[PDB]
Design a protein around this motif. Structure first.
Motif, PDB file in Angstrom:
ATOM      1  N   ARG A 190       0.968  -1.095  -0.153  1.00  0.00           N
ATOM      2  CA  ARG A 190       0.141  -0.056  -0.004  1.00  0.00           C
ATOM      3  C   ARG A 190       0.831   1.264   0.047  1.00  0.00           C
ATOM      4  NH1 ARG A 190      -3.952  -3.014   1.367  1.00  0.00           N
ATOM      5  NH2 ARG A 190      -6.193  -2.310   1.702  1.00  0.00           N
ATOM      6  N   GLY A 191       0.324   2.331  -0.477  1.00  0.00           N
ATOM      7  CA  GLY A 191       1.107   3.639  -0.563  1.00  0.00           C
ATOM      8  C   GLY A 191       1.645   4.044   0.995  1.00  0.00           C
ATOM      9  N   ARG A 192       2.666   4.640   0.835  1.00  0.00           N
ATOM     10  CA  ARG A 192       3.538   4.695   1.806  1.00  0.00           C
ATOM     11  C   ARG A 192       3.605   6.452   1.986  1.00  0.00           C
ATOM     12  NH1 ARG A 192       2.998  -0.032   2.771  1.00  0.00           N
ATOM     13  NH2 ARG A 192       4.776  -1.503   3.356  1.00  0.00           N
ATOM     14  N   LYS A 216      -3.135  -2.076  -7.532  1.00  0.00           N
ATOM     15  CA  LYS A 216      -4.438  -1.490  -8.190  1.00  0.00           C
ATOM     16  C   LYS A 216      -4.059  -0.312  -8.714  1.00  0.00           C
ATOM     17  N   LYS A 217      -3.164   0.559  -8.197  1.00  0.00           N
ATOM     18  CA  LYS A 217      -3.199   1.898  -8.936  1.00  0.00           C
ATOM     19  C   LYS A 217      -2.332   1.623 -10.162  1.00  0.00           C
ATOM     20  CE  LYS A 217      -1.469   5.148  -6.143  1.00  0.00           C
ATOM     21  NZ  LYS A 217      -0.578   6.049  -5.578  1.00  0.00           N
ATOM     22  N   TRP A 218      -1.349   0.564 -10.284  1.00  0.00           N
ATOM     23  CA  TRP A 218      -0.769   0.197 -11.663  1.00  0.00           C
ATOM     24  C   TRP A 218      -1.847  -0.222 -12.631  1.00  0.00           C
ATOM     25  CZ3 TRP A 218       4.747  -2.166 -10.081  1.00  0.00           C
ATOM     26  CH2 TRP A 218       5.537  -1.222  -9.345  1.00  0.00           C
ATOM     27  N   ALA A 278       9.040  12.636  -3.900  1.00  0.00           N
ATOM     28  CA  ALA A 278      10.227  12.914  -2.935  1.00  0.00           C
ATOM     29  C   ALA A 278      10.049  14.247  -2.385  1.00  0.00           C
ATOM     30  CB  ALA A 278      11.543  12.624  -3.555  1.00  0.00           C
ATOM     31  N   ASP A 279       8.603  14.753  -2.102  1.00  0.00           N
ATOM     32  CA  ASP A 279       8.493  15.969  -1.901  1.00  0.00           C
ATOM     33  C   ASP A 279       8.555  16.226  -0.112  1.00  0.00           C
ATOM     34  OD1 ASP A 279       8.153  18.690  -2.761  1.00  0.00           O
ATOM     35  OD2 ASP A 279       6.735  18.793  -1.435  1.00  0.00           O
ATOM     36  N   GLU A 280       8.300  14.837   0.718  1.00  0.00           N
ATOM     37  CA  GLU A 280       8.542  14.953   2.027  1.00  0.00           C
ATOM     38  C   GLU A 280       8.572  16.436   2.605  1.00  0.00           C
ATOM     39  OE1 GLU A 280      11.628  12.627   3.902  1.00  0.00           O
ATOM     40  OE2 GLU A 280      10.126  11.384   4.453  1.00  0.00           O
ATOM     41  N   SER A 281       7.679  16.935   3.014  1.00  0.00           N
ATOM     42  CA  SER A 281       7.847  18.219   3.668  1.00  0.00           C
ATOM     43  C   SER A 281       6.725  18.228   4.737  1.00  0.00           C
ATOM     44  CB  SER A 281       7.273  19.209   2.630  1.00  0.00           C
ATOM     45  OG  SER A 281       8.362  19.344   1.923  1.00  0.00           O
ATOM     46  N   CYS A 287       3.013  20.882  -3.314  1.00  0.00           N
ATOM     47  CA  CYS A 287       3.864  20.115  -4.391  1.00  0.00           C
ATOM     48  C   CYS A 287       3.849  18.963  -3.931  1.00  0.00           C
ATOM     49  CB  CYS A 287       5.067  20.824  -4.710  1.00  0.00           C
ATOM     50  SG  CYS A 287       4.585  22.295  -5.517  1.00  0.00           S
ATOM     51  N   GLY A 288       3.622  18.135  -2.952  1.00  0.00           N
ATOM     52  CA  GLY A 288       3.738  16.881  -2.528  1.00  0.00           C
ATOM     53  C   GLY A 288       2.288  16.212  -2.681  1.00  0.00           C
ATOM     54  N   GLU A 289       1.365  17.045  -2.756  1.00  0.00           N
ATOM     55  CA  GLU A 289      -0.097  16.725  -3.210  1.00  0.00           C
ATOM     56  C   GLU A 289       0.103  16.336  -4.767  1.00  0.00           C
ATOM     57  OE1 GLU A 289      -2.470  17.282  -5.602  1.00  0.00           O
ATOM     58  OE2 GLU A 289      -4.166  15.988  -4.978  1.00  0.00           O
ATOM     59  N   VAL A 297       1.454   7.411 -13.121  1.00  0.00           N
ATOM     60  CA  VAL A 297       1.523   6.518 -11.782  1.00  0.00           C
ATOM     61  C   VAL A 297       2.271   7.506 -10.919  1.00  0.00           C
ATOM     62  CG1 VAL A 297       2.289   4.850 -10.508  1.00  0.00           C
ATOM     63  CG2 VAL A 297       1.019   4.410 -12.341  1.00  0.00           C
ATOM     64  N   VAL A 298       1.840   8.174  -9.749  1.00  0.00           N
ATOM     65  CA  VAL A 298       2.791   8.650  -8.736  1.00  0.00           C
ATOM     66  C   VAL A 298       2.771   7.897  -7.373  1.00  0.00           C
ATOM     67  CG1 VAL A 298       2.817  10.907  -7.266  1.00  0.00           C
ATOM     68  CG2 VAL A 298       1.742  11.118  -9.512  1.00  0.00           C
ATOM     69  N   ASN A 299       4.092   7.525  -6.983  1.00  0.00           N
ATOM     70  CA  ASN A 299       4.272   6.771  -5.767  1.00  0.00           C
ATOM     71  C   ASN A 299       5.335   7.456  -5.128  1.00  0.00           C
ATOM     72  OD1 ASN A 299       2.565   4.210  -5.463  1.00  0.00           O
ATOM     73  ND2 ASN A 299       3.405   3.831  -7.596  1.00  0.00           N
ATOM     74  N   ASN A 300       5.146   7.245  -3.627  1.00  0.00           N
ATOM     75  CA  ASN A 300       6.032   7.860  -2.717  1.00  0.00           C
ATOM     76  C   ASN A 300       7.379   6.957  -2.746  1.00  0.00           C
ATOM     77  OD1 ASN A 300       6.618   7.043   0.458  1.00  0.00           O
ATOM     78  ND2 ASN A 300       6.489   9.205  -0.010  1.00  0.00           N
ATOM     79  N   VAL A 301       8.401   7.634  -2.425  1.00  0.00           N
ATOM     80  CA  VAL A 301       9.805   7.054  -2.325  1.00  0.00           C
ATOM     81  C   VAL A 301       9.614   5.759  -1.687  1.00  0.00           C
ATOM     82  CG1 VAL A 301      12.079   7.211  -1.299  1.00  0.00           C
ATOM     83  CG2 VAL A 301      10.990   9.398  -2.383  1.00  0.00           C
ATOM     84  N   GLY A 315      -6.661  17.634  -0.323  1.00  0.00           N
ATOM     85  CA  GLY A 315      -6.673  17.088   0.966  1.00  0.00           C
ATOM     86  C   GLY A 315      -6.146  17.775   2.074  1.00  0.00           C
ATOM     87  N   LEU A 316      -5.412  18.927   1.635  1.00  0.00           N
ATOM     88  CA  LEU A 316      -5.202  19.867   2.731  1.00  0.00           C
ATOM     89  C   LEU A 316      -6.040  20.531   3.350  1.00  0.00           C
ATOM     90  CD1 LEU A 316      -1.864  22.246   2.466  1.00  0.00           C
ATOM     91  CD2 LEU A 316      -3.994  22.863   3.506  1.00  0.00           C
ATOM     92  N   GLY A 317      -7.137  21.266   2.554  1.00  0.00           N
ATOM     93  CA  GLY A 317      -8.390  21.703   3.329  1.00  0.00           C
ATOM     94  C   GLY A 317      -9.135  20.694   3.938  1.00  0.00           C
TER      95      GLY A 317
HETATM   96  C1  LIG Z   1      -1.271  18.268   0.924  1.00  0.00           C
HETATM   97  C2  LIG Z   1      -0.746  17.020   0.692  1.00  0.00           C
HETATM   98  C3  LIG Z   1       0.566  16.903   0.628  1.00  0.00           C
HETATM   99  C4  LIG Z   1       1.205  15.505   0.497  1.00  0.00           C
HETATM  100  N1  LIG Z   1       2.642  15.536   0.508  1.00  0.00           N
HETATM  101  C5  LIG Z   1       3.132  14.201  -0.077  1.00  0.00           C
HETATM  102  C6  LIG Z   1       4.529  14.006   0.059  1.00  0.00           C
HETATM  103  O1  LIG Z   1       5.295  14.720   0.410  1.00  0.00           O
HETATM  104  N2  LIG Z   1       5.028  12.715  -0.412  1.00  0.00           N
HETATM  105  C7  LIG Z   1       4.093  11.594  -0.985  1.00  0.00           C
HETATM  106  O2  LIG Z   1       4.555  10.832  -1.373  1.00  0.00           O
HETATM  107  N3  LIG Z   1       2.813  11.847  -0.862  1.00  0.00           N
HETATM  108  C8  LIG Z   1       2.098  13.118  -0.464  1.00  0.00           C
HETATM  109  N4  LIG Z   1       0.877  13.150  -0.579  1.00  0.00           N
HETATM  110  C9  LIG Z   1       0.258  12.160  -0.998  1.00  0.00           C
HETATM  111  C10 LIG Z   1       0.271  12.256  -2.630  1.00  0.00           C
HETATM  112  O3  LIG Z   1      -0.725  13.206  -3.142  1.00  0.00           O
HETATM  113  C11 LIG Z   1       0.023  10.848  -3.235  1.00  0.00           C
HETATM  114  O4  LIG Z   1      -1.141  10.150  -2.339  1.00  0.00           O
HETATM  115  C12 LIG Z   1       1.153   9.794  -3.017  1.00  0.00           C
HETATM  116  O5  LIG Z   1       2.412  10.394  -3.748  1.00  0.00           O
HETATM  117  C13 LIG Z   1       0.880   8.510  -3.729  1.00  0.00           C
HETATM  118  O6  LIG Z   1       1.905   7.706  -3.768  1.00  0.00           O
HETATM  119  P1  LIG Z   1       1.693   6.300  -2.686  1.00  0.00           P
HETATM  120  O7  LIG Z   1       0.242   5.710  -3.030  1.00  0.00           O
HETATM  121  O8  LIG Z   1       2.900   5.621  -2.994  1.00  0.00           O
HETATM  122  O9  LIG Z   1       1.500   6.736  -1.200  1.00  0.00           O
HETATM  123  C14 LIG Z   1       0.312  14.506  -0.045  1.00  0.00           C
HETATM  124  C15 LIG Z   1      -0.929  14.856  -0.231  1.00  0.00           C
HETATM  125  C16 LIG Z   1      -1.561  16.066   0.210  1.00  0.00           C
HETATM  126  C17 LIG Z   1      -3.235  16.160   0.213  1.00  0.00           C
END
Ligand SMILES: Cc1cc2nc3c(=O)[nH]c(=O)nc-3n(C[C@H](O)[C@H](O)[C@H](O)COP(=O)(O)O)c2cc1C
Ligand SMILES: Nc1ncnc2c1ncn2[C@@H]1O[C@H](COP(=O)(O)OP(=O)(O)OC[C@H]2O[C@@H](O)[C@H](O)[C@@H]2O)[C@@H](O)[C@H]1O
Ligand SMILES: Nc1ncnc2c1ncn2[C@@H]1O[C@H](COP(=O)(O)OP(=O)(O)OC[C@H]2O[C@@H](O)[C@H](O)[C@@H]2O)[C@@H](O)[C@H]1O
Ligand SMILES: Cc1cc2nc3c(=O)[nH]c(=O)nc-3n(C[C@H](O)[C@H](O)[C@H](O)COP(=O)(O)O)c2cc1C
Ligand code: SF4
Ligand code: SF4
Ligand code: FES
Ligand code: FES
Ligand SMILES: [Cl-]
Ligand code: NA
Ligand code: NA
Lengths: 156, 417, 418, 156
Positions: free
Chosen positions: C63-65, C74-76, C92-95, C181-183, C216-220, C393-395
């Motif tokens: 699952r997404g990390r 599923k995403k793929w 890799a925006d991790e903030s 920009c992590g969204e 596809v966007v995925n986390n590091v 999701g921020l709001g």
């Molecule tokens: C405001 C906001 C910030 C986010 N910041 C990050 C971030 O820094 N890194 C990240 O991988 N996902 C972040 N996400 C989630 C991403 O939108 C997205 O769900 C994710 O990158 C998908 O990868 P995963 O399925 O491997 O988790 C953030 C979401 C929101 C709403």
């Protein structure tokens, strides 16, 4: 026939893996053995030699050389009493007397229960706190018999 | 949680080696870092090894392990020989009266570790050892833990702080032999053998551990190195007299009011150590003698000497055991004799039999059971331990006792007559 | 190859997977990676069909990390149902406050991430991949650039990789100070050279992402699992930890613990175990008051026994663990969370724009003891009304943690009112 | 008529050639400009727009949006101090106080010589090492004022 318990064997193997060369671990291994058994069992030396990839007589010579190792007497706690110059000046003999009063033994002897052995040793590097003794790894200044008695009560 | 350690008193006029170790507890890496720890290492890694050697040379730092050899020059000798090279911290400290090194180890381990890393980098050693005596179990556990802290913070391992410099420090334990403080017996022990000194030359810097260039330095020596880099060599040389510069630890024991370790400059006199710093004598009794560990015996007429490495100075490790007017010098000599008897490694015949006979005959003298021949034999044996000896133990096993015979003839004669 | 200074974050692993090399605080280069058997998963993957790789990643239960815990396989699958070309993006925006897990992979074991990107890209038929790394990770940027070059030279990137006929280039983009920009949709906008403005979702990126193409966007951290899944097979991977929430997980632990750092643990581990068993307990052995799950949730000391998994009652999120102890002022802490969201709303949506701002501004007045009765009632109202009409999701979460503190620590807030 | 120095223009062109489309390079380009000048010169935007084949206002909007870019204060070294939750709990205020003691400035201020500017930033992703600061690209844990002084003296 003699085998190290896995609990000990694991620690020995850890020491042997620690330095770049196996044979450098010899003293750490022998400390570990004496910690486990309360002495160096003669039988233990052959399997250790194998583990160190050393000849037996090499290991035997090392055990013979280093004064901390004891193949003769099993003792749960080693009371090391400094008999060097500073502790002698400041009251080694008062400490030995107190030990005799509490435990009923003199230097080189073990209590009947195998619990305590008094070991006379050279300077322990705590001369400002003379007269000095250790109980296994713990080290203390002797103040008086009542104080010594309290300290010894902590080792059961 | 470490084994119990007596709380040795510590006092400093310089606030360097004892800045943290004046307090009797383990100072971990966070405390060390707060005091600016490991910044000297960072600075050193931005210098060439050669530069670091030059600084240590110009500092005038000398060995603190007893012989006072210039540290930078020792390093230079090593690096003129092909690698790989090894660095050894000598933590065997086992000479009677000497307890200076342990308080660095047990209270400020990172000062020592930082020193080891800088020194290893200086001589191109990627493998360093601490050889700590078996009777310092607390110091051993404290050092192991401190080394792990240092690894966590990236001061040890590969490519330290992006420098390209690799180092591992291994901690080995002694197991009861004073002779394993002699640098070549130490190396033999590290190689997994009995502690038998080697014929020198060659010196370790030419042929040491596994026959490779090896620098052996005392704990206290190494603990100076972070200061030299941090302050610069010129500022370091401002500390104390310019010919014997830097802080020095003095372990003071026996008949003083405040026994403990004193960090002082080396222009301090022996009288000042006893009376100005260590609080004078127990009961305000007269000083009879000072034993410089088991090496020398100074009389009450020799208290105005400087605590430096000069011909007329105190020398040794600055170990000060004070005897007062009621202390029997012959009884005290017996204890010194007993020490050497118990510690000769036995390789050399005059040392083997001489250390034993000196103690054996001196016991007979002390107990009043000595024949005329035992007396004459004791005298002869005391003068004849040194011949053929291959290390300094045989060279000095009779030294202190001879000095008592010369400086306190009246007391000796009392036992003869 | 001098990189900028990086603090040496402590890292500990019981599993020896993601942190096998990254438990050591230094750059591991391609030869060390190779010596540990790196890039053999890639070679194995290239001898598999894309479809089968997707199947393994699916069956792994990965699952997404990055926070939401969406099933990766599923995403793929969704992406590849849509015509190409397709794009793969490493996030890799991790903030988020408290979160520092991704950077230790990036900075210490970059080839683990690169290998995962290549496999993932192959799985979804992407010939162009991106790493978007926050601008405040400059060392990570240079480390990745160098690692990509290393991979190129060993023939793991470029055209016809290892004779497979698969082509891939990985481009490294830098952020420049916006948490938003992590969204994933704002990330994509930024990659397209624009402001980081989230897009309405759906469509999800797998349908319309970079240049409107399946993405596809995925986390590091997610991506870093992929080499293991291929290497040991999905069965063995699923044997790691509990069968439902299987696999290693990184837990960045900060605040009032003795051993702050990153912990690689299975997700059956409890929050209590993380703090006391692994992180060494609390500073000064003080009682735990709360754990902030980054800036998302606030757990009380009554909630320490929850599993660190993606179950409904689990800790969830990114596994970010900020520990507060008994003397830490919860209102002061909530102010810092409020300040974060004020600084990071992108301002597209009105309740979010004005809500994040007013939440911070009013809470500061409350904290300083300058709040009127109207300011108090206004704060409460604004906290409840950041979310309406929000398109990301921020709001939806800007008020979430702060509300939880109001509910779980009423007495401490009352002190500020009374 | 503002022009980029040749050595900078080359690096910009390199970023622009890096991605498939020119306009993706905008943030890398702006980082390069800020690295070179110590801030974003408002005059630099027009020729950057030309090189990216973008409208000027597009470029201005981007500069305005991204917090790392600064169009107002030139500074050789940016000291980014984290002010988010974890660093705050662990001692942001100690770090700021130390910075004021050494440099004589508060957040948002530049030193008279234009050497240091303190920039308050959100979480730097190094929370375990709180309180965190950066000096340009270098990142550090703050330990104490003595430690900080030594670090800052490395930047001349
Ligand atoms: C405001 C906001 C910030 C986010 N910041 C990050 C971030 O820094 N890194 C990240 O991988 N996902 C972040 N996400 C989630 C991403 O939108 C997205 O769900 C994710 O990158 C998908 O990868 P995963 O399925 O491997 O988790 C953030 C979401 C929101 C709403
Ligand atoms: N010519 C040389 N070349 C290289 N290194 C040398 C040389 N001479 C000495 N050294 C080094 O200087 C240090 C001191 O050497 P020695 O003078 O030989 O002294 P040592 O035998 O190590 O110790 C004697 C000391 O111990 C105690 O008995 C007492 O304090 C005495 O001063 C050692 O590390 C040794 O290798
Ligand atoms: N129906 C779907 N089809 C395809 N992809 C989908 C679908 N639903 C979700 N996804 C994908 O799953 C991932 C997570 O989606 P969301 O639940 O929308 O999460 P997101 O808004 O990206 O992240 C929220 C997270 O960030 C933090 O605020 C916090 O940790 C929160 O959990 C994204 O990559 C998204 O495209
Ligand atoms: C018998 C004997 C014992 C010694 N014991 C020690 C000791 O415990 N510690 C020490 O550092 N040096 C000891 N030395 C001196 C060492 O051989 C060597 O000179 C020293 O470790 C070098 O370090 P230095 O130059 O920093 O003093 C001893 C020498 C001899 C002859
Ligand atoms: S002089 Fe004595 S201690 Fe030294 S090597 Fe010879 S016998 Fe051993
Ligand atoms: S919810 Fe907030 S951060 Fe998200 S798009 Fe709307 S204004 Fe921007
Ligand atoms: S003389 Fe006993 S500890 Fe030194
Ligand atoms: S809160 Fe400061 S680095 Fe995360
Ligand atoms: Cl071997
Ligand atoms: Na110089
Ligand atoms: Na297949």
């Amino acid at each position: 026939e003699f085998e190290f318990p896995e609990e000990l064997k694991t620690k020995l193997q850890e020491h042997i893996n620690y330095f770049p060369k196996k044979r450098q671990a010899i003293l750490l291994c022998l400390h570990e053995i004496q910690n486990y058994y309360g002495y160096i069992p003669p039988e233990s030396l052959k399997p250790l030699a194998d583990m160190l990839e050393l000849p037996l007589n090499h290991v035997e010579g090392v055990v013979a050389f280093y004064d901390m190792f004891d193949r003769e007497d099993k003792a749960k706690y080693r009371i090391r009493v400094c008999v060097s110059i500073v502790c002698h000046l400041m009251g080694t003999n008062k400490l030995l007397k107190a030990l005799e009063n509490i435990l009923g033994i003199k230097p080189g002897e073990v209590t009947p229960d195998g619990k305590f052995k008094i070991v006379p040793v050279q300077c322990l590097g705590a001369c400002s706190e003379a007269p000095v003794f250790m109980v296994n790894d713990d080290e203390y200044k002797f103040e008086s018999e009542v104080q010594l008695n309290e300290i010894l009560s902590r080792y059961t | 949680s470490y084994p119990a350690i007596p709380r040795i008193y510590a006092e400093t006029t310089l606030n360097m080696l004892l800045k943290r170790a004046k307090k009797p507890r383990v100072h971990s890496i966070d405390e060390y870092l707060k005091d600016g720890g490991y910044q000297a290492l960072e600075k050193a890694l931005n210098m060439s090894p050669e530069e670091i050697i030059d600084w240590v040379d110009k500092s005038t730092l000398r060995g603190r392990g007893g012989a006072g050899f210039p540290t930078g020059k020792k390093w230079k000798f090593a690096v003129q020989n092909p690698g790989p090279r090894y660095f050894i911290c000598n933590a065997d400290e086992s000479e009677p009266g000497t307890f200076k090194d342990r308080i660095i180890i047990e209270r400020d381990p990172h000062l020592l570790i930082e020193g080891i890393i800088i020194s290893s980098y200086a001589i191109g050693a990627n493998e360093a050892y601490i050889y700590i005596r078996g009777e310092y179990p607390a110091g051993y556990y404290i050092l192991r833990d401190a080394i792990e802290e240092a690894k966590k913070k990236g001061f040890l391992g590969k490519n330290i702080l992006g420098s390209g410099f690799d180092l591992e420090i291994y901690v080995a334990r002694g197991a009861g032999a004073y002779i394993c403080g002699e640098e070549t017996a130490l190396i033999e022990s590290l190689e997994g053998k009995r502690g038998h000194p080697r014929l020198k030359p060659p010196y370790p810097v030419q042929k040491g551990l596994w026959g490779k260039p090896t620098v052996v330095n005392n704990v206290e020596t190494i603990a100076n190195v972070p200061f030299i880099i941090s302050m610069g060599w010129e500022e370091y040389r401002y500390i104390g007299p310019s010919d014997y510069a830097g802080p020095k630890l003095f372990p003071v024991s026996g008949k003083v009011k405040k026994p403990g370790v004193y960090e002082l400059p080396m222009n301090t006199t022996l009288r000042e150590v006893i009376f100005k710093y260590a609080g004078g004598t127990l009961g305000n009794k007269k000083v009879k003698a000072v034993f410089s560990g088991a090496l020398d015996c100074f009389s009450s007429e020799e208290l105005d000497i400087p605590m430096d490495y000069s011909p007329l100075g105190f020398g040794g490790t600055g170990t000060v055991i004070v005897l007062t007017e009621e202390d029997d010098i012959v009884e005290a000599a017996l204890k010194i004799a007993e020490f050497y008897e118990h510690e000769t490694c036995g390789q050399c015949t005059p040392c083997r039999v001489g250390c034993y006979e000196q103690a054996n005959l001196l016991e007979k003298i002390y107990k009043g059971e000595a024949t005329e021949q035992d007396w004459e034999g004791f005298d002869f044996v005391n003068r004849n331990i040194q011949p053929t000896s291959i290390c300094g133990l045989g060279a000095v096993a009779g030294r202190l006792i001879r000095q008592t015979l010369e400086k306190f003839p009246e007391e000796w004669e009392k036992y003869r007559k």
